[PDB]
Amino acid sequence: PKSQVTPSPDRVKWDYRGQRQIIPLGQWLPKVAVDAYVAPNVVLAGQVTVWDGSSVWNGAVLRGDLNKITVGFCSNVQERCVVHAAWS
Amino acid sequence: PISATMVGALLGLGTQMYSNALRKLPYMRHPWEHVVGMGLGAVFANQLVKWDVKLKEDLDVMLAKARAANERRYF
Numbered sequence: 660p661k662s663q664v665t666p667s668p669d670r671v672k673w674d675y676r677g678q679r680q681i682i683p684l685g686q687w688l689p690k691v692a693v694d695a696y697v698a699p700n701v702v703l704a705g706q707v708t709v710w711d712g713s714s715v716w717n718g719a720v721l722r723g724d725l726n727k728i729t730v731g732f733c734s735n736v737q738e739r740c741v742v743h744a745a746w747s
Numbered sequence: 748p749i750s751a752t753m754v755g756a757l758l759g760l761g762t763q764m765y766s767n768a769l770r771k772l773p774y775m776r777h778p779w780e781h782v783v784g785m786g787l788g789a790v791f792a793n794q795l796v797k798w799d800v801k802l803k804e805d806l807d808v809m810l811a812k813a814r815a816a817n818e819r820r821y822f
């Protein structure tokens with residue numbers, strides 16, 4: 660039992676940049692086609708591929724940190740959908 | 748009528764929009780290069796007509812020379 664935490668004095672309580680939509684993890688950079696529409700509220704982390712005609716809507720999180728995530732041609736992921744990948 | 752300037756401008760705008768479409772981009776992506784394409788198309792069409800006239804004149808002169816050379820066979 661601890662019941663003790665140490666607040667950080669350099670922690671940021673308001674990021675003027677907001678949340679970055681494309682979050683590369685090391686060498687994994689999400690690839691978004693120029694034809695595809697990704698809402699500004701969407702977060703794409705890790706290796707996530709969005710193809711032509713695809714669309715990702717508000718509040719959706721596509722975390723491809725563990726394994727690959729792919730969204731096909733003219734396939735859409737609608738509002739506030741969490742798409743995640745596991746190791747196996 | 749249909750002048751070389753307008754057909755050239757339409758071809759330039761069309762090739763700009765065609766290039767934009769071929770890259771999955773919106774048609775009117777960069778308007779400034781659309782204007783540049785219209786200007787270049789007009790210039791190229793006018794130059795093509797100006798070159799065609801001179802080319803036909805040169806061909807007429809050269810065929811006159813060839814016919815004159817052939818006509819000497821009968822002497």
Ligand SMILES: CCCCCCCCCCC(CCCCCCCCCC)(CO[C@H]1O[C@@H](CO)[C@H](O[C@@H]2O[C@@H](CO)[C@H](O)[C@@H](O)[C@@H]2O)[C@@H](O)[C@@H]1O)CO[C@H]1O[C@@H](CO)[C@H](O[C@@H]2O[C@@H](CO)[C@H](O)[C@@H](O)[C@@H]2O)[C@@H](O)[C@H]1O
Nearest residue numbers: 749750751754755758759788791792795796797800803804
């Ligand atoms: C692919 C598109 C299809 C469009 C074609 C069909 C649509 C009709 C428009 C065809 C068009 C543009 C050609 C567009 C080129 C395409 C662009 C290429 C890519 C660009 C991105 C040419 O069409 C005319 O051109 C004539 C040639 O002058 C030709 O007549 C023959 O010529 C004799 C040869 O010597 C033959 O012996 C004889 O049999 C015919 O008399 C014919 O080709 C035709 O009558 C329109 O004419 C345009 O050119 C000339 C007129 O001449 C006009 O300016 C001229 O300038 C001086 C001359 O330099 C003159 O001093 C001046 O007086 C005159 O004002 C222009 O204002 C405009 O009118």
Ligand SMILES: CCCCCCCCCCCCCCCCCCCC(=O)O[C@H](COC(=O)CCCCCCCCCCCCCC)COP(=O)(O)OCCN
Nearest residue numbers: 755758759760762763780781782783784785787788789791
């Ligand atoms: C003939 C039938 C009628 C057809 C219609 C003709 C109409 C007249 C022509 C209209 C052309 C409209 C073009 C508008 C201007 C846009 C040019 C911007 C190009 C530019 O900014 O330079 C960089 C690329 O250069 C380039 O893109 C230069 C590309 C040039 C390719 C050809 C070079 C000449 C070859 C000789 C002719 C072809 C063979 C003929 C026998 C851009 O770079 P970026 O930002 O996009 O990113 C890196 C990509 N590299």
